[PDB]
Symmetry: C3
Subunit: 232 residues, 3 copies
């Protein structure tokens, strides 16, 4: 009901279908997406294309079980033997940027941008988000994106390698078709090794302390109301 | 005496003021900068801009005739520690060349706004010296491994244009541009910034030298090639 | 017999001389290269330039008809160890395609000067093979994680132009350009170069495969798909992979 699943020969296309919410992740969407990823391997299909309806790829989080479901989604994508080509049709923000980064490859529409607006909202990220972002845009730009909420445009994404290509859903599907013809076991090995570069990192004690501090702060409530931040 | 400190609203600007030596570091200057960084919070500032007076950001280290030269390595460690631990983001307004110790200092900034005529360089291979592991790891993260190899193994200069290409420079601009950006950053949520800065700085760049690294480090520094730098080297 | 060695001033040039196979590695070539690297400092040389004869830098590995093919992986380990341990900086003059084992070799050079028509590629996904962890880590560090994913998962070629963009190529230029730069580097302090090279090579790229990595590596190398890729190439047709 919140995603559409279609297959053309050996490519499975999964479309986020909450355009009116910019494909914001709620519990139902995350559950349905997780199942789609896990069931993609009933192939036939040897590649997945993940894309969104409307102007946005995914604008972030939209409830008690939501964090656990989100972890399970990322686990399912990380563990999938199939390569996921993200057709980033528009902005990927917050949890939506996390989702875009969990794709194996990215084909990005000209008007898409990538952003962690965490510094505007007083929030804090998990370590993987920061590490994978650093690997994809380079440390310098990651510092700007994280400390100042800087938007990464499609053009700079192509520059850094966040975007493998600039293009459309059709372009992504065409590439996924070529990839679907390659040797699955070679793809599986490389994906596992690449994902095991160290980005999957448990927060250090200092990181957890600051993380909990930010999430429990008054500044988070203040940013919603407005901002006059206090540092507490 | 060797730095200037000014504040405009929530932005503190710290300026290295030794233009007679192109802002080359010594014990006094380093200690003064360290205190400037540490006290930066005790006055409601939310962002720091670090910059150099005159044509250079920081041309390196010049310990003549520093009566406290023996304290210099310790003071430099303290300066880097203070910047790394500072809850406020430090925008480097790299107004001109950042060389050696000056490049290390530039890289310890949280963000960089680089003047069009500035360049970055480790001339260590010309002097027969060796760097700490952090300098090498942080450089690799900022310019990419490939360019890091050229900068370290051949003393290649990184222009402002290529700095922007790689992300070493976040922007090309002036002190005023850096100050304007800092003012925007100062309006953001401090706890969010602190967390991200901590995690980013804990990417593994802060690394104790391996046994083989220490042995080559000590050999380089204790070498006649350092004394030599016509600087015809012997490798001894 | 498979390498040429010349020296001008303090620069030793090592030329891969198996152009008939586009300098594709075998046991003999690798052993000879290893010896040249190890002996490079027995002269007055302070820098090495490594380059290929003919159109290619190194098109991969070709073990037909290598009587010592079973020695190849051990010889390859020794080559990479010799280059990693060499006190001398190696400037790769990548005169043409560097593919598979050739890309590995190019990446083990300390610096790269790349001819305008050269490209880099790991066609592993076309052949059903799997790489050691170092190749993947060093590639990611040179082209960036994003491009590394495309090169590894989709056999994407890295052009000279994009190599320059990412830093895989330090310069676009010729053998003479590489030799000129090597001469400059040869005038620098050897101890400083040695320290920096050691620390840079110790960035974590030299990594033992994790248990899951080894399991997938062995599975790929032992698969029917590897045979199918060789048959399909021998029959000039698209391969029909099974995922086993």
């Amino acid at each position: 009901a919140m995603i559409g699943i279609t297959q053309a020969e050996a490519v499975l296309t999964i479309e986020l279908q909450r355009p009116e919410r910019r494909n914001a992740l709620n519990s139902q969407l995350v559950e349905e997406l997780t199942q789609a990823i896990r069931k993609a391997g009933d192939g036939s299909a040897r590649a997945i294309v993940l894309t969104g309806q409307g102007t946005a790829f995914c604008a972030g989080a939209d409830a008690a079980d939501y964090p656990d479901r989100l972890i399970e989604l990322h686990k399912a994508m990380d563990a999938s033997p199939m390569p996921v080509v993200g057709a980033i049709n528009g902005p990927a923000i917050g949890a939506g940027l996390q989702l875009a980064m969990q794709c194996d490859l990215r084909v990005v529409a000209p008007d898409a941008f990538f952003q962690f607006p965490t510094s505007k909202y007083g929030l804090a990220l998990d370590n993987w988000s920061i590490r994978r972002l650093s690997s994809l845009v380079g440390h310098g730009r990651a510092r700007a994106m994280l400390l100042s909420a800087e938007k990464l445009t499609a053009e700079i994404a192509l520059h850094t390698g966040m975007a493998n290509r600039i293009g459309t859903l059709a372009d992504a599907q065409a590439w996924a078709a070529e990839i679907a013809r390659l040797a699955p076991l070679a793809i599986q090995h490389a994906k596992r090794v690449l994902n095991d570069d160290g980005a999957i990192e448990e927060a250090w004690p200092a990181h957890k302390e600051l993380f909990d501090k930010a999430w429990g702060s008054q500044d988070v409530i203040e940013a919603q109301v407005a901002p006059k931040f206090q540092g507490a």
